[PDB]
Structures are given as structure tokens and as C-alpha cells.
Amino acid sequence: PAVEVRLDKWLWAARFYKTRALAREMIEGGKVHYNGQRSKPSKIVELNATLTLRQGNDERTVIVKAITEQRRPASEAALLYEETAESVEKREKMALARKLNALT
């Protein structure tokens, strides 16, 4: 089955975490959810799955659009998923509010 890529490898390939070991720690900390639930490092990624993950102190919800074992460049990897519009908005709004409480 050459259509089986682990969630920890995937998260690293998609550049969400610097190393697979870190991606594995985040998963085990419950900081990454797969279709709304705790997952595991060895979970095989499926196209269109919904992943919710912690980025520093940001939360992003992305939909898996491609699977690969290669970690490509910044702009290139970024193409293995599509962040949801609701996720981008939530992030923005929190960022804005941050900059607001700042100018006050």
C-alpha cells in the first residue's frame, strides 16, 4: 500500500512542525485533532480529512488536499492542504483584536 502516509510524517511534510518528533509530541498532547478527535502518530492520512492544530498560540483548521512523504519548500508544501475560510477568519479576528487592545 503506497498510499499510506502517517499523520506525524504528513504534518512535517506539510511544514506545520519542524520535525516529525515534534509533530508526534503535539499529536500526543492532543494539540492536533483528526476529524474532531484525538489521533495518533501512526494514523494514515486520508484526503479531505479535517485537521485542527495548534500553531504556537494560533489555531488552524485545515482540509487535507494531498499526501506525500517529501517536505518541500515553504510556499510549495503549503499546497498539501487548504485552511478553512472559517479558520482564516478566526485567526485574523484574533490578530486584529490583539492589535486593537494594543492601540489602547
32 with 11: CB under 8 angstroms? yes
- Domain of 42: which CATH number? 3.10.290.10
Resolution in angstrom units: 2.0
Q: How many domains does the chain have?
A: 1
- At 41, list the grid cell: 502518530
How was this structure determined? It was done by: X-ray
84 with 59: CB under 8 angstroms? no
Query: Nearest CA to 11 among 59, 81, 58?
Result: 81
79 with 54: CB under 8 angstroms? no
Strand partners, 53: 32, 60
Instruction: Please tell me the number of Cα atoms within 13 Å of 85 on its side-chain side.
Output: 0
30 with 38: CB under 8 angstroms? yes
Query: Nearest CA to 17 among 3, 4, 5, 31?
Result: 31
Residue that has been written with the C-alpha cell 489555531 in this structure: 59
Query: Nearest CA to 6 among 64, 85, 79, 78?
Result: 64
3-state secondary structure of 76: helix
Domain containing residue 68: 1-104
DSSP H/E element including 32: strand 32-34
Residue that has been written with the C-alpha cell 485542527 in this structure: 52
